[PDB]
Design a protein around this ligand. Structure first.
Ligand SMILES: *P(=O)(O)OCC(C)(C)[C@H](O)C(=O)NCCC(=O)NCCS
Ligand SMILES: *C(=O)CCCCCCC
Ligand SMILES: *C(=O)CCCCCCC
Lengths: 412, 79, 412
């Protein structure tokens, strides 16, 4: 079986414009959740979000093209540029070498993609008729246009694939990339999860099902995974990106090796469209298959942990059941307190975060742990980051429709 | 003639911002794809922004025969 | 070398509610394109579509649940129910047997999913605020809710995956299911591509880029792949579904065997966001990879063939290049004349059509062939079906962003 390594990483979120500044702020327990400014939320039951306020699209694409890409794609071009440069793979023109281009693909993930663009053109069409629908509407909004713009930007011509499994999309995009390399459909895969849905119909959609925290007065305390006072997730925007390469190809070209891919698991609950399976049953199966595949001792778990009553509970139950007991669960944290839950991008952001934790021996903490929840009785690395060497990390993602994905990376 | 010239100036301004180019290159003999770096998508969006900036409405079939900026200006002139 | 077979099929489109009626009408060269009636298109430049007018959602769903699902999901439930029933897998309660359930997953595909739902809720929030956003909005629009609703309806708990690669999503959904079974992640997969976007902003989006035929006066003559008088595609709605099954497990069950999976190919153009690569180069590579995996003689090609100028031209060039010469291209037909181009569902529909063509020794024709295009010089089975037995079939799909997918099925 082919072995796979991570050779390049990048990420952009509400606490940093690159993976270095972002992880530092996350390990310090800072919080990027702010009062919403990207639209007028004054009349909304939810007025906070993990917004990025220092992102400039004209730094990643020329001004003429900014209009052609939804914000989630602008964020994806930023993160992939970092990862592609980090990997050392680009040639003198910042393109993938031609003799390698056919064998390097892209696997992208998002839950809905350019929602704000659908929303805007929907309103244009309703108020002024179809002739006011901008020509750049469609390709600015489709989720797979992440792989569209990124493949044109870097000239990669391998399998061009897109996962749209809701809040697990970013983790499934990693796994589909792994599957493609394992079956010799590519030697390298750019992986990127990206989501930006802080817009009126985006916030209202999750508010109307009471999924979001309404602690509007304290944006920095709203997102509190596993805490007894958690009252819904806080929506974040961002993108995370990885370069995966077959192990021998990375060695031959002298690649930086952040981690080796170890194992994955995918399952469905077949229970409910938004609620998790009882006892996190589907999550348990995905987690067990990834652990049985990786066959390594996991020292750290980055939980999905969206700070909602039912997710955080049923994820904790599933973790105890898979590791046998609460005492056998490795240190766990959710970084959704710091940057919000970034939906389809979360799986990708949290794989970058998790590998960096391993690289640095620094396990970031679950912030805003103020009141223990007796039913959430794991070690959530509360408030303070933990200095600890680990040899393997596991990241969990679950999505509406009951779809579960788990990945395990191990030390190189 | 002066009205035609002012119309041409406005059209050139609109084309410049859309394709992100100087008013220098947008001459009556300039081709959108060859001389201005625009693709079909750029062109249809330029045609839209001219219909909105000038309140006009170019029917589908006219927009078909648009090669140089002169073509656009002359259509807007027939009006 | 896990071998993989098709053991059940279903489809719904503008020419029928099940695969028997639909394929018969398609092979006869009927046409399901009609004037749009599902919204008021009287002020639109494009007023025709492949609308399904005889579909009753209450026949597939409890009437109370219809409101919970976008139309594309309703069509997916119709097609997957037909294929599941067709497979003989279901127990007395029309659910997957509990001891097979963990190893049967679902691979779904769509380009945008519930666009009409997003458009409607966007207008509600804009005119009357976020309190007017329906709580069923998100779970009725997400693309992966195809897999969500179907996995719940059939009790299938394996990998729950979703592809959003635009007009290639249906074919990529087949390929992800194949890859999953090849890597032993499942023994059976339900595959379904589904799309329903005949709504103001969906039609407006594609007319804004001048991709749609404006032959409004003659709906049944507007869709004419490879014809010299083609002038854009006609949007269709529908869903196709397949049950894939590892071969030994199918034989043990006594399953019927429609076909055996033989090969696939995936590539990206890295060229343009809507136009194909020069000479259909990405299509060429995807077809070449599929053909070299299958190692069979392909006797029929269901082309992507949308009735656009660029696609039909560059697909013909890439076909000629991959088989060697015009004479060496197998019989080729596009069925988009008959049912419209169905976007994310096209690849799933067209795999069902291709396999049925194999089963019955009837190759359906490319209709409305009235004026030969000199640049489109292949054998397109013009106007009338051809009675000819074949031992393998190939189906092509290409999408915005330059993403290509090809699959080959062989007789079994
Ligand atoms: P421009 O000359 O690029 O025109 C834009 C349009 C929308 C015409 C575009 O190039 C086009 O025709 N694109 C797709 C053609 C097609 O059917 N492709 C198959 C994948 S959708
Ligand atoms: C996560 O599973 C909740 C839904 C994510 C969809 C994307 C954002 C609208
Ligand atoms: C096909 O490639 C065209 C775009 C994909 C479907 C989008 C539906 C709005």
């Amino acid at each position: 079986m082919r072995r796979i390594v991570v050779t390049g990483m990048g990420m952009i979120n509400s606490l940093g414009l690159n993976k270095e500044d972002s992880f530092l702020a996350i390990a310090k327990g800072e919080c990027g959740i702010k009062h919403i400014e990207s639209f007028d939320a004054s009349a909304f039951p939810v007025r906070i979000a993990g917004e990025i306020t220092d992102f400039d699209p004209t730094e990643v694409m020329n001004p003429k093209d900014v209009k052609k890409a939804g914000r989630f794609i602008q964020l994806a071009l930023k993160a992939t540029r970092e990862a592609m440069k980090d990997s050392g793979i680009l040639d003198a023109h910042n393109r993938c070498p031609e003799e390698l281009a056919n064998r390097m693909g892209v696997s992208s993930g998002s839950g809905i993609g350019g929602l704000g663009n659908i929303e805007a053109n929907s309103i244009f069409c309703f108020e002024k008729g179809p002739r006011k629908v901008n020509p750049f509407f469609i390709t600015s909004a489709l989720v797979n246009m992440i792989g569209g713009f990124t493949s044109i930007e870097f000239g990669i011509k391998g399998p061009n694939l897109s996962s749209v499994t809701a809040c697990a999309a970013g983790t499934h995009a990693i796994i589909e990339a792994v599957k493609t390399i394992l079956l010799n459909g590519a030697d390298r895969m750019l992986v990127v999860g990206a989501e930006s849905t802080i817009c009126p119909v985006g916030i209202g959609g999750f508010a109307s099902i009471k999924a979001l925290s309404t602690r509007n007065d304290e944006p920095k305390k709203a997102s509190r995974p596993f805490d007894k006072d958690r009252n819904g997730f806080v929506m974040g925007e961002g993108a995370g990106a990885l370069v995966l390469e077959e192990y021998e190809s990375a060695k031959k070209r002298g690649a930086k090796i952040y981690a080796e891919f170890a194992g994955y698991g995918e399952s469905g609950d077949a229970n409910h469209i938004t609620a998790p399976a009882p006892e996190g049953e589907g999550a348990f199966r995905a987690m067990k298959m990834a652990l049985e595949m990786a066959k390594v001792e996991v020292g750290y778990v980055n939980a999905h942990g969206t700070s909602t009553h039912y997710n955080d509970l049923y994820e904790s139950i599933a973790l105890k059941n898979v590791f046998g007991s609460k005492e056998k669960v490795p240190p766990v944290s959710s970084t959704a307190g710091q940057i919000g839950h970034c939906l389809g991008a979360a799986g990708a952001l949290e794989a970058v975060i998790s590998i960096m934790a391993m690289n640095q021996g620094i396990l970031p903490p679950t912030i805003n742990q103020e009141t223990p929840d007796p039913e959430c009785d794991l070690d959530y690395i509360p408030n303070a980051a933990r200095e600890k060497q680990v040899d393997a990390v596991m990241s969990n993602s679950f999505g509406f429709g009951g779809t579960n994905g788990v990945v395990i990376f191990k030390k190189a | 003639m002066g009205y035609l010239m002012a119309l041409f100036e406005d059209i050139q301004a609109v084309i410049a911002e859309q394709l992100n180019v100087d008013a220098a290159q947008v001459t009556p003999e300039a081709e959108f794809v060859k001389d201005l770096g625009a693709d079909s998508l750029d062109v249809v969006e330029l045609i839209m922004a001219l219909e909105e900036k000038f309140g006009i409405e170019i029917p589908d079939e006219q927009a078909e025969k648009i090669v140089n900026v002169g073509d656009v200006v002359k259509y807007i002139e027939d009006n």
